[PDB]
């Protein structure tokens, strides 16, 4: 697959890759490096609930390469600005973090987790992540000029902001390449249309264009509470398509290749409301599970994990239950046990990792979208070791390649 940044998954992971696990726990930052030694290493005495007073409801914590060396850094949008702990290359990070910009923060700019979105993204092909925020006035960017130097925030576009009516309980915003030039464009599921704003590569986005009159709360009755939507390449040309988990099942609108979109089609009669899928019980993902390197469908359902494989053109094979685990029936809960679909083995076919009640578990893809047995990774970064959704943040992330 390709680099798409979403609200649900603001830290993209590489296909192929051997993703690491990163936890912002009470006591600070801990990593599990993907390797022959599986252990938890504490790396930063900060960015934690107790270590610095970091709060899920006030602050944002991400990973991103802010230097251009393909190593991920820790990035926190704190009370009064943006703090970065850079990767030292050896499973250590700079501590204390450095405050790079007095903006995009609770008390510097009036940023609110419940109103605004903050990402890091290399928006100008410099190799380094710029700060990008969907704020009040529109989209703001702080340019990453290297050496830890971030420029004062500049308005990238006067759209997709709270002022323009954008709401986290109604609407969705993504960064994804819809043209194939490698620049991440805005894709926004608004009140009545899906819009794109083309990335000009210079810290600005072009005027919004409506591309589809569906997939929205006011067009087709798509709600945040029942009908998740994603953007992902379903054909293998590196250009992002639209995919929605609706009522009858999965609908898509395919990119024509130039960032305009096709008609909306029902392509699979599963993974929707009518087949019993529920945002409160289940996790629904699109990731590459095969050597076709396109978006396949993965659902963590009741009885286990279900998969429908993309034929390579956005049509799908039959739904198969591939693992009898990680499901609601096995006690896995959306509010307690983070589950990710990411490559942990370097073959290009995404695997499964789940932060369970007692242990972190993984289940590896055989290379063809079928899976091996469940494997216990470590007894840490779990509910029973004091990690909750309300006080901790957990990601899969490529710290290195
Ligand atoms: C959340 C958010 O967007 N904050 C931004 C605000 C709002 O757009 C305006 O306060 C809307 O009135 O504008 C700034 O120029 C500012 O005043 O500091 C930049 C800041 O980062
Ligand atoms: C959330 C959302 O879709 N906002 C869009 C709105 C709404 O469609 C109107 O509020 C409907 O009346 O219209 C705009 O032209 C605007 O206000 O600049 C574009 C903006 O992106
Ligand atoms: C969420 C969802 O599945 N929406 C689907 C809707 C709704 O079923 C009806 O609009 C509700 O009355 O039906 C469509 O034909 C439409 O109107 O666009 C396709 C769309 O994908
Ligand atoms: Ca794999």
Q: Are 217 and 190 in contact (CB under 8 A)?
A: no
Compute the distance from residue 221 Cα to the ligand 3 centre, in Å.
6
Q: Are 132 and 156 in contact (CB under 8 A)?
A: yes
Compute the distance from residue 160 Cα to the ligand 2 centre, in Å.
8
Compute the distance from residue 368 Cα to the ligand 4 centre, in Å.
10
How was this model experimentally determined? X-ray
Distance separating alpha carbons of residues 204 and 211, to the nearest angstrom: 20
| Domain residue limits at 354 | 1-401
Distance separating alpha carbons of residues 222 and 359, to the nearest angstrom: 35
List 316's β-bridge partners, or say none: 310
How many secondary structure helices (H) and strands (E) does the chain include?
A: 0, 29
Tell me, rounded to whole angstroms, the distance of Cα 148 from its chain centroid: 24
Helix (H, G, I), strand (E, B) or coil at 28: strand
For the CA of 226, the closest atom of ligand 3 is: 1
Q: Which residues, chain by chain, have CB under 5 Å from ion ligand 4?
A: 343, 345, 347, 349, 351, 365
Asked whether the CA dihedral 175, 179, 183, 185 is positive or negative, the reply is: negative
Compute the distance from residue 341 Cα to the ligand 4 centre, in Å.
10
Measured from the alpha carbon of residue 346, the closest ligand is: 4
Resolution in angstroms comes to 1.8
Radius of gyration for the chain, computed over Cα atoms and rounded to the nearest angstrom: 20
Q: Is the CB of 136 under 6 A from ligand 1?
A: yes
Q: Is the CB of 171 under 6 A from ligand 2?
A: yes
Compute the distance from residue 211 Cα to the ligand 1 centre, in Å.
28
Give the closest residue to 148 by CA, choosing from 100, 102, 101. Answer: 100
Q: Are 211 and 258 in contact (CB under 8 A)?
A: no
Q: Are strands 185-189 and 117-121 parallel, antiparallel or unpaired?
A: unpaired
Q: Are 110 and 82 in contact (CB under 8 A)?
A: no
Q: What are the angstrom distances between the C-alpha of 371 and each of 114, 229, 292, 306, 377?
A: 38, 25, 17, 11, 16
Half-sphere exposure for 29 (CA within 13 Å, toward CB): 29
Q: Are 351 and 287 in contact (CB under 8 A)?
A: no
Number of domains in the chain: 1
Q: Is the CB of 111 under 6 A from ligand 1?
A: yes
Q: Is the CB of 103 under 6 A from ligand 2?
A: no
Measured from the alpha carbon of residue 213, the closest ligand is: 3
Q: Are 288 and 368 in contact (CB under 8 A)?
A: no
Distance separating alpha carbons of residues 200 and 177, to the nearest angstrom: 12
Q: Is the CB of 191 under 6 A from ligand 2?
A: yes
Distance separating alpha carbons of residues 47 and 53, to the nearest angstrom: 8
């Amino acid at each position: 697959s390709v680099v798409v940044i979403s609200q649900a998954l603001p830290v993209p992971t590489r296909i192929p890759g051997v993703a690491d696990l990163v936890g912002f726990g009470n006591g600070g930052v801990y990593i599990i490096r993907n390797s022959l030694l599986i252990q938890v290493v504490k790396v930063i005495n900060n960015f934690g609930y107790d270590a610095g007073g970091w709060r899920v409801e006030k602050h944002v914590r991400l990973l991103a390469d802010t230097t251009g060396d393909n190593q991920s850094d820790v990035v926190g949008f704190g009370e009064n600005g943006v703090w970065i702990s850079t990767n030292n290359g050896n499973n250590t990070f700079v501590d204390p973090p450095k405050m790079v910009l007095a903006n995009f923060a609770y008390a510097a700019g009036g940023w609110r987790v419940e109103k605004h979105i903050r990402f890091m993204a290399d928006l100008r092909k410099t190799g380094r992540a710029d700060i990008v925020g969907f704020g009040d006035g529109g989209i703001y960017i702080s340019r990453n000029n290297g050496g830890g130097q971030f420029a004062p925030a500049q308005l990238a576009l006067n759209n997709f902001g709270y002022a323009q009516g954008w709401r986290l309980d109604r609407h969705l915003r993504f960064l994804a390449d819809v043209t194939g030039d490698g620049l991440l464009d805005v894709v926004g599921f608004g009140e009545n249309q899906v819009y794109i704003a083309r990335n000009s590569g210079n810290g600005t986005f072009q005027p919004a264009q409506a591309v589809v009159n569906n997939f929205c709360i006011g067009a087709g009755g798509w709600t945040i509470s029942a009908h998740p939507r994603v953007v992902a390449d379903l054909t293998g040309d590196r250009k992002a398509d639209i995919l929605g988990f609706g009522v009858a099942g999965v609908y898509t609108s395919l990119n024509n290749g130039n960032g305009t979109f096709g008609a909306v089609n029902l392509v699979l009669k599963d993974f929707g409301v009518n087949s019993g899928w529920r945002v409160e019980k289940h996790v629904r993902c699109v990731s590459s599970l095969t050597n076709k390197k396109v978006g396949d469908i993965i659902g963590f359902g009741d009885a286990g994990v279900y998969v429908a494989l993309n034929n390579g053109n956005g049509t799908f094979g039959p739904v198969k239950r591939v693992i009898d685990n990680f499901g609601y029936n096995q006690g896995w809960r959306v509010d307690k046990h983070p589950r990710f679909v990411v490559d942990l083995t370097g073959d290009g076919c995404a695997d499964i990792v789940g932060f369970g009640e007692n242990s972190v578990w993984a289940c590896m893809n055989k290379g063809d979208g079928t899976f091996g047995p469940i494997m216990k990774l470590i007894d840490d970064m779990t509910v029973s070791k004091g990690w909750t959704l309300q006080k901790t943040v957990r990601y899969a992330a490529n710290l290195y390649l």
